[PDB]
C-alpha cells in the first residue's frame, strides 16, 4: 500500500532524524502513515527515541531498544536511553489508535510547558522560594520492524501520587500555578501563557506536584496551542489570575495592558 511505503525509513531519513529535524520536516515526512495498532507488549523492540527541545525547537532521534511490559493497575517500559537506569518509566498509547501527529503535538506541548517551568524554577531558586511544581518530561518511541515504523508510544518517568485540581508549603499550589502562568506570559515576550491547575501531587500530599493537561494560549499559533489565542490570554489575566500574589512580585512580573478581543 502507499502507507507501508511512507512508514519505511530510508538511510536518508535516519541520517536526518539522528542529526535533528525541524517540526515541519518531521510532520510532513510522516503524513501518509495513517494509524497504527497497539504496540505488542511483553516484548523487546528496536526503536527510535525522539526528543523535542523548545530551546532549539528540534526533534532528535537516537537508536535504542525498548522492552514493553505489563499495563499499570499505561504500561511499564524500559529502554536503553533512560535518564535513570534504576528508575521506572511508563509508556502510553491512545486507547483509540491515532496518528503520529497527535503524539508529537502532545510531546511538544509538554516540553514547552516544561521549558517555561524550568526557567520559572530557576527564578524561584534565585529568590529563595522552594520549587514546588514541575512538568514530567515526555519522549517519543517509534517502534520499528525492519526499518518500518509499526508503532508510536509516549514515554514518561513513573510518578506515584494522586490527581488534584490545586483547589483543596509557603504558598498555595494555586499561587504557584498562576504565578507560573504569568511568568510564561512575560518570559515568552507576551506571546504565550500556560494555564493548568491540575496534576499529580506526591508524598502523602506534602510533596512536589507534576502538572498535567497543560493549556497553552498564544498569538503565535502552533499545532499544540489552544483555539483561543489572545482571547485565552485575556481570560487568564481578567478572570483566572485577577490579582497577583507574592511570587509574581518577587519575580518582578508586571500587569499586562490588554483589551477583551473579538
Amino acid at each position: 500500500k502507499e502507507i507501508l511505503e511512507a512508514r519505511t525509513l530510508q538511510p536518508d531519513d535516519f541520517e536526518k532524524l539522528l542529526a535533528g529535524v525541524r517540526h515541519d520536516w518531521l510532520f510532513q515526512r510522516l503524513e501518509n502513515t495513517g494509524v497504527f495498532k497497539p504496540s505488542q507488549l511483553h516484548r523487546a523492540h528496536s526503536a527510535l527515541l525522539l526528543k523535542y527541545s523548545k530551546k532549539s525547537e528540534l526533534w532528535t532521534a537516537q537508536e535504542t531498544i525498548v522492552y514493553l511490559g505489563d499495563y499499570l493497575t499505561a504500561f511499564w517500559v524500559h529502554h536503553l536511553h533512560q535518564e535513570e537506569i534504576l528508575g521506572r518509566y511508563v509508556g502510553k498509547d491512545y486507547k483509540e489508535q491515532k496518528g503520529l501527529w497527535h503524539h508529537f503535538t502532545d510531546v511538544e506541548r509538554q516540553m514547552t510547558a516544561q521549558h517555561y517551568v524550568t526557567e520559572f524554577n530557576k527564578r524561584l531558586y534565585e529568590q529563595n522560594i522552594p520549587t514546588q511544581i514541575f512538568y514530567i518530561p515526555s519522549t517519543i518511541l517509534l517502534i520499528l520492524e525492519d526499518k518500518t515504523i509499526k508503532g508510536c508510544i509516549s514515554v514518561e518517568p513513573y510518578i506515584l501520587g494522586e490527581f488534584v485540581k490545586l483547589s483543596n508549603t509557603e504558598y498555595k499550589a494555586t499561587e504557584y500555578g498562576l504565578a507560573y502562568g504569568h511568568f510564561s506570559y512575560e518570559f515568552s515576550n507576551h506571546r504565550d501563557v500556560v494555564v493548568d491547575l491540575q496534576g499529580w501531587v506526591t508524598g502523602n500530599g506534602k510533596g512536589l506536584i507534576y502538572l498535567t493537561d497543560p493549556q497553552i494560549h498564544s498569538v503565535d499559533q502552533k499545532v499544540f496551542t489552544t483555539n483561543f489565542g489572545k482571547r485565552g490570554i485575556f481570560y487568564f489575566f481578567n478572570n483566572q489570575h485577577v490579582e497577583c500574589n507574592e511570587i509574581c512580585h518577587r519575580l518582578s512580573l508586571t500587569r499586562p495592558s490588554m483589551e477583551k478581543p473579538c
Binding site: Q62, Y67, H78, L80, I85, N121, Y125, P130
Partner: protein
C-alpha cells in the same frame, strides 16, 4: 542483606532509640554489647575504633589515593552490634558503625532509616560526634527529594565553616579541604538539577581544583566530578559551552582542546573512567556515556564528514572498553551493571551499523541485544535470588556472544588491575582553591 530486611532492622534500631528516650539507664546490656562487638572480624573492629577516633571525615576506599566487600560481608553483624551498643548507651560506637555502613546503605537506598537512627542517637546524647559524611548524606537525600534550600543550607554551612560540624574533630587541613570540595560538588549537582548548566559547571570545576589541592588527589572524587561535568557539557547549549570555554579562571585542557560540548563531554568521560580505573562499574558507566556522546556527535551536522568515521571508531573503543570490564563466566549481580552491559553491547552494535551497513553480523548482534533486553527485563521483574542469578548468567552469556560476533579484542595494560587502556591514563596527568571559596 536485602534492602527490605535491612530497612526493617534499621527501623527496629530507631524504635529502640525512641524507647530508650523515655527511660533511665543493666550489666546484661554491656555484656550483649561486648559480645556483639567481639563476634565481628578484626578488620571491622579496627574500622570501628578508627571511626570512633574520627581519623577521617569519610571512610577510605581502596584505590582512592575492598571496603564494599568487607562491609557487605559483616553488614548483619555490624547492624547487630549497632543495636547492641544502642542498648548499652555507647552512642559513640553506634555512631561509628553508622559512619561505617553509611556509604553501603546509600547504595542500598535506605539512607533514610540510617539517618533516622543517627538523629535518634544525637537525641540520646547530643555530644556524640557524627561524621561529616553522614551530614553530607542528609544533604544528598535533601537534594534527591527536591529540598534544594535545606541541602544548600547544610552544604554552605559546612563550606563556610571549613568543614566544621557538630562535635567532630578534624586531624588536618587536607580533610577540611576535601569536605569543602565534596560539598561544592554537591552544590554543582544542585544547580545541575535546576538546569543552570554554566554555574553548575563552575562549581564542578571548583570541586576539581579542590580535589587536586590535596597532598594525594582524591581520584574517586575526581572521577565523580568529571562525570558530572560530562553530563553538564552534554546538557549545555552551544552558547553555555562557548561561555565556559572562554572563562579565564577555568584552566581545563579538555576545553582549550575541543570546540564542541559533546567532544568535551566525551573527553571528560574518558578522564572519569581513568580516575576510576580499578572499579569496573564506574568505567562501564563513563564509557557508555562517552560512546553515546560520540554517536551523537558523529551523527550531527557539526561533525566534519572527514572525521565522522574517526569519531565512530572512538565510540567503538568506548563501548569495547565497557564490554571488556567483565569476562566469560564472571558473575554480575547489579541491575544497573546488567543494564549498562546491554547498553554497551547495543552501542557497539550501533557503531558497527553506522560504520558497516545492514550486514549479517550486525543483524545477529541486534537480535542478541534484543534477547538480552528481554532477559534483563525479566531480571528486573523477578524477586528470587536463584532466578535472578540464572537471569544474570543468561544476560552475560548473550553479552559474551555479542563480544564474539563483533570481534572484541582485549587491550594489554601494564597495570594488570586497570580496566581502561593506557591512552586514558596518558591524558590524566595534564588535567590543568582558597581563592575559589
Amino acid at each position: 542483606n536485602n534492602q527490605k530486611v535491612v530497612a526493617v532492622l534499621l527501623q527496629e534500631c530507631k524504635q529502640v532509640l525512641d524507647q530508650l528516650l523515655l527511660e533511665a539507664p543493666s550489666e546484661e546490656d554491656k555484656s550483649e554489647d561486648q559480645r556483639c562487638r567481639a563476634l565481628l572480624p578484626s578488620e571491622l573492629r579496627t574500622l570501628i575504633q578508627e571511626a570512633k577516633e574520627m581519623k577521617w571525615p569519610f571512610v577510605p576506599e581502596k584505590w582512592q589515593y575492598n571496603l564494599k566487600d568487607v562491609i557487605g560481608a559483616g553488614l548483619q553483624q555490624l547492624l547487630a552490634s549497632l543495636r547492641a551498643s544502642i542498648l548499652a548507651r555507647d552512642c559513640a560506637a553506634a555512631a561509628a558503625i553508622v559512619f561505617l555502613v553509611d556509604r553501603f546503605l546509600y547504595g542500598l537506598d535506605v539512607s533514610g532509616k540510617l539517618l533516622q537512627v543517627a538523629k535518634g542517637l544525637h537525641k540520646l546524647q547530643p555530644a556524640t560526634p557524627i561524621a561529616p559524611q553522614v551530614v553530607i548524606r542528609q544533604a544528598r537525600i535533601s537534594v534527591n527529594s527536591g529540598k534544594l534550600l535545606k541541602a544548600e543550607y547544610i552544604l554552605s554551612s559546612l563550606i563556610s565553616n571549613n568543614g566544621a560540624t557538630g562535635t567532630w574533630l578534624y586531624r588536618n587541613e587536607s580533610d577540611k579541604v576535601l569536605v569543602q570540595s565534596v560539598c561544592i560538588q554537591i552544590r554543582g549537582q544542585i544547580l545541575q538539577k535546576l538546569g543552570m548548566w554554566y554555574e553548575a559547571a563552575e562549581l564542578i570545576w571548583a570541586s576539581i581544583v579542590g580535589y587536586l589541592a590535596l597532598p594525594q588527589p582524591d581520584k574517586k572524587g575526581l572521577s565523580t566530578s568529571l562525570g558530572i561535568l560530562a553530563d553538564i557539557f552534554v546538557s549545555m547549549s552551544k552558547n553555555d559551552y562557548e561561555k565556559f570555554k572562554n572563562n579565564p579562571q577555568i584552566n581545563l585542557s579538555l576545553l582549550k582542546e575541543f570546540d564542541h560540548h559533546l567532544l568535551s563531554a566525551a573527553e571528560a568521560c574518558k578522564l572519569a573512567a581513568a580516575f576510576s580505573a580499578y572499579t569496573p562499574l564506574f568505567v562501564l558507566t563513563a564509557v557508555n556515556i562517552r560512546g553515546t556522546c560520540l554517536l551523537s556527535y558523529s551523527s550531527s551536522n557539526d561533525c566534519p564528514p572527514e572525521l565522522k568515521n574517526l569519531h565512530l571508531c572512538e565510540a567503538k573503543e568506548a563501548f569495547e572498553i565497557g564490554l571488556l570490564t567483565k569476562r566469560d563466566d564472571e558473575p554480575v549481580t547489579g541491575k544497573q551493571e546488567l543494564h549498562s552491559f546491554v547498553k554497551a553491547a547495543f552501542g557497539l552494535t550501533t557503531v558497527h551499523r553506522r560504520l558497516h551497513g545492514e550486514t549479517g553480523t550486525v543483524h545477529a548482534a541486534s537480535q542478541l541485544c534484543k534477547e538480552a533486553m528481554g532477559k534483563l527485563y525479566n531480571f528486573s521483574t523477578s524477586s528470587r535470588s536463584q532466578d535472578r542469578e540464572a537471569l544474570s548468567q543468561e544476560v552475560m552469556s548473550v553479552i559474551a556472544q555479542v563480544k564474539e560476533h563483533l570481534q572484541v579484542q582485549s587491550f594489554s595494560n601494564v597495570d594488570d588491575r586497570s580496566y581502561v587502556p593506557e591512552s586514558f591514563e596518558c591524558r590524566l596527568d595534564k588535567l590543568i582553591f582558597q581563592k575559589i571559596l
